[PDB]
Design a protein around this ligand. Structure first.
Ligand SMILES: OC[C@H]1O[C@@H](O[C@@H]2[C@@H](O)[C@H](O[C@@H]3[C@@H](O)[C@H](O[C@@H]4[C@@H](O)[C@H](O[C@@H]5[C@@H](O)[C@H](O[C@@H]6[C@@H](O)[C@H](O)O[C@H](CO)[C@H]6O)O[C@H](CO)[C@H]5O)O[C@H](CO)[C@H]4O)O[C@H](CO)[C@H]3O)O[C@H](CO)[C@H]2O)[C@H](O)[C@@H](O)[C@@H]1O
Length: 100
């Protein structure tokens, strides 16, 4: 019913991944994703992590170590708890087009 804010993904140079969303009175944010490999629905994913506090208005997940390449695909879903209830951005797809 409620629509989760779309995730913003960023390929960091020379290495790393950041994934974040603005907060909307949430109590948790989780990111589930794979590298160049499609998700079979709500599988856990290669990256699979609960984030438990926001900072500067955003919920941020990072992998400080992945070396991403132009053209890399990330398939994902996110999960958010708002007022004790869960919501998902489903069927996420992102292509690395630039580094930040
Ligand atoms: O110590 C024991 C054990 O603990 C584990 O750690 C816990 C940890 O895994 C947990 O992490 C949270 C995670 O579970 C949660 O995942 C949810 C997921 O549960 C949800 O799954 C749904 C099912 O709920 C649903 O079941 C249906 C049910 O709702 C309905 O009422 O009845 C149906 C019966 O007819 C039943 O089928 O079925 C659907 C499939 O159709 C599932 O998809 O899905 C959501 C996504 O929608 C998913 O997010 O997410 C939380 C937030 O990210 C996680 O934090 O957290 C616990 C702490 O709170 C931990 O204790 C360990 O892993 C084990 O090793 C330990 O032994």
């Amino acid at each position: 019913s409620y629509v989760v804010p779309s995730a913003k993904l960023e390929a960091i140079y020379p290495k790393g991944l950041r994934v974040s969303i603005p907060d909307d009175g949430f109590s948790l944010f989780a990111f589930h994703g794979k590298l160049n490999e499609e998700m079979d629905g709500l599988e856990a994913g290669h990256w699979a992590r609960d984030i438990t506090k926001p900072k500067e208005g955003r919920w941020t997940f990072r992998d400080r170590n992945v070396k991403l390449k132009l053209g890399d695909k990330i398939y994902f879903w996110t999960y958010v708890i708002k007022d004790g209830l869960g919501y998902r951005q489903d069927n996420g797809e992102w292509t690395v087009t630039e580094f930040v």
